[model samples]
Target: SSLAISVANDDAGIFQPSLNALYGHPAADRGDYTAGLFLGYSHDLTDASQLSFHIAQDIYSPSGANKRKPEAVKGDRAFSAFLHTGLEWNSLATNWLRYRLGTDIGVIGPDAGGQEVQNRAHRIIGAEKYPAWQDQIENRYGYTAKGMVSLTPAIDILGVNVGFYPEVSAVGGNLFQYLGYGATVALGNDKTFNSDNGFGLLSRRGLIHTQKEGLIYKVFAGVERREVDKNYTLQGKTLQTKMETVDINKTVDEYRVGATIGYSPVAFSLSLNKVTSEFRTGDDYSYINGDITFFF
Candidate 1:
């Protein structure tokens, strides 16, 4: 219930870091895991083929209750929203044939506005001022079909300059369905178009980037496992029949660690995420994301 797989806007992916205008406080925002905003674009219609598009706004709150007190919200975890749009195809070449075919469009809960963008991003970072929109999640939406494939290889660790990605993913339709497998290990830039050869994904991001000159960098770690049949942020239409809409952990486990720093065109990225509980009283949470390269 704590996930913030941020955004990376670019012609070359693997760059996100602005700390959302430098961490606005509120005990560093845990629970709902702050807000999610991703705007995108991509290029390279040749030389390894690439094309991308994205729009995002993911918000979910109450991960064990009380972001500043909400009259002790029921059990824990509710308040959701996920509106995403995508059109993707990537394979930024390094050999071993990488791949990703995509199509996504989703909107769930209160028409996916998610409580006015989570209380207007907590009053533009002043925090406190989000009193549950009757516990969110109503109006659902769907359409999704994504695929993944990876086996990109390049080695020379002792000399530093490694890239090893082992991937497998399948996301069917109906808002969001899952079946996954993950692997991402890179050091010192070798990014791709998508599949985040870089890193970041609550819903997926980091579009097109075929290495952008001088002093580029990347530090990553990943893990994934999903088998949920459908997850519109935990599924439901709250207010009573919603009440934290439990019953669905189908088997979820996610984790990732990140870092990215660039020079020439200027870049920055930082990510820290971990998710394990999806329901069953739900209790696992962690979030921290970075993005600052949406091409000013």
Candidate 2:
């Protein structure tokens, strides 16, 4: 069994396109605030099989411009907790194929204490407002439920591991809707593909047990497309009216790049990503992610 904790924040630094477009030319000395933390546990069922579960919390602020300001355009602030579980098996018919399945459930809005936390945090930051809070995205939208299935196939050539992962997912509830598809290409040392290397915290990384005690590295890139539906945030609603929002884009695209480095029972990863604009305005955003895991 192993325990893992992962965290990500997008406000570290501001790049020209994403930062300036959303904040301002000078960026208002602020940055979009999107942060998440996940705590997970994994247990090996067999040499090549494992089960894992996690609890997560995510916090979001529409734009840096709204950090502590009372302006309406700054958008609503929200947070929520989620529960997830998954199973991965590498003992497949083919030596090159691994399979994984997972699901997640979460609740947003007043029942989840999203508003109270947002108001308290903003107030502490000196952005106090009358009434303490206002209508927000989570308040408009409510809960989330999603499921995913993926396959990873890999081959080793000249001490190098090469693999591809293809996945499909469907989500419903107030958060999002539609079908999503994506795939990733990974290249690294052969040890990185060993099933005993310990399962990674991120779904994009796949599962491997951590029995090997040496250096391992993997670099990967992926792209995904999502068909959106019932996005209350985009519809500009503060209360859940169960209204159907306009579809800005029938599809959304995301590009990702990242690398992982590990030694013995510890590993670290850093990833950068760019997501196509979600709104009709055609504005896009980028993210920087980092993760570390330890196994025993």
Candidate 3:
């Protein structure tokens, strides 16, 4: 999450740089979730409208405990391309409230470049053979629409102004459907910045705080419960191989905690994310994310 490089005169809005990576503790099954790179871009269509796109790939590896499982689908992989567009409007009915609407489309799976990369990474890692089947959804597309409302309220504690930001959002998509809630408690130079204006809970905020030039710091936490329905991996086209499509209709609970530090045009953030097991018992995992953004 590098800074969003604003176009001169704000005519083209803010153009953001998008390079991101997620590293998980190798011992956790999380090693398979987001162990890779992403290239993306976000542009502000106007002060209140934005559009973004990203191409992401992940390489999955078995955890220490998973490698011993007879049916573990280690070395599986996936690729996805996504487009997200959003609009934000001030609340005409009251202060301290904002409304947002957004939609997203993601094209994912083997057809998106999952197979080749999965093979290449396996070879590089010294795997004797690629897994017999992929456990991921491939050659499919899904879409989502999201709506959220945020309330930012401030209070004076001693000589410091503390900000409380609460938000609720819902999403419906072919790939996933969920309801989520989040809040942030910030203690800083409240007169200088508003932290919630840049991005929503599921997006990278970057160095795009829209306020005076100063320092701002905050802590945030969130929870989400979702249902996922996607086509699972199967034998591609080989006659000798047998493939099965899994119905991974399960509920997942996610918890996240993170902190951010920013000074004007530059910001850095780190967070730890945990989720309920998806496919197997004792498979819950935690991962870490770090982002640096420079704004102009």
Candidate 4:
């Protein structure tokens, strides 16, 4: 519900954009036009390993989640589907491991005006004893999996890659009531996600390479356990508190470590990071980022 936006400089300072106080009210970010389509593919089974595929679609069209019910805005459109699969290993010594799995679904509307405006917004918030919009419009389902391992398979150093990981996920919709977990550790090479000579600003970095000066490097660490969910609606005496926080800590924990350096002919890149948790209310944090990527 919070898309996040801030342009800054108001209160007489001028420049503005707005929308961020945790995203509440004001609804109309301007009557919808949300559309999405994505396709991905990868195949090369063996000599290491590779087989991947992806498809995505999204449509909002005149939807702002239903402009507060412009006659229930055709049941506030929503449909989602996702799947992932992965595997990679360069044959022992040189260390390697990779794995991934995924799933997600969301299909709302098309039934008697979205179940009568989701049963009248769950009977005016009483949530009709927690039915909350057909359990977020008939099971929103979710799942994900990942694993990665590799530590200096001896490329004489540079090109170094290291890894560790743990991840968790869950969703039940009505805006999810909980289920989340995370863990990560990483160090990288392969030109550290480089571009214009700088050590690719790490994580998901790519492009430019031939060696000889113009270096690149990467490092990392991570942790997570996110959860939250709350609801209130006691009329008769006015107690309307509707809070929906989700992360259902099967175990709450968080951590992060980071580093990056770059010098590829000078496009520029430098990153540093730190993170910690206790369910993250800021239990220690640091961040610095300077990056640029341009190539012709």
* Top model number, TM-score: 2
Off by over 4 Å in 1: 1-21, 27-30, 34-43, 46-50, 53-59, 67-78, 83-85, 88-104, 109-136, 142-204, 208-214, 217-259, 262-268, 271-287, 290-296
lDDT over C-alpha atoms for residue 77 of model 4? 22
TM-score of each: 0.31, 0.70, 0.63, 0.21
Tens-digit lDDT track of model 4 for 230-292: 111000011121222121223333333435455554334333322222121112222233334
lDDT of 3 by residue, 169-265 (tens): 6667664456656665556554223434322225443333343345656666655555544322211221122233222436656655666677866
Output the worst ten-in-a-row residue range by lDDT, candidate 4.
1-10
TM-score of the candidate numbered 2? 0.70
Highest lDDT scorer: 1
Better model by lDDT: candidate 1 vs candidate 3: 1
- Candidate 1 per-residue C-alpha lDDT over 1-296 given as tens digits, one digit per residue, 9 for 90 to 100: 00123442111122223322333233223364446677767665675776677778777776534544543255555677778777777664556767778887887777778777667756998977766666666767777788777787766566456777778777887667888887877776444422255222333444436544556667777777877887766666575444545676788776667766755555666666556667776655555656655421
User: In candidate 2, what are the lDDT values of residues 54-101, reduced to their tens digit?
Assistant: 666555444444444432342232222222333333333245445544
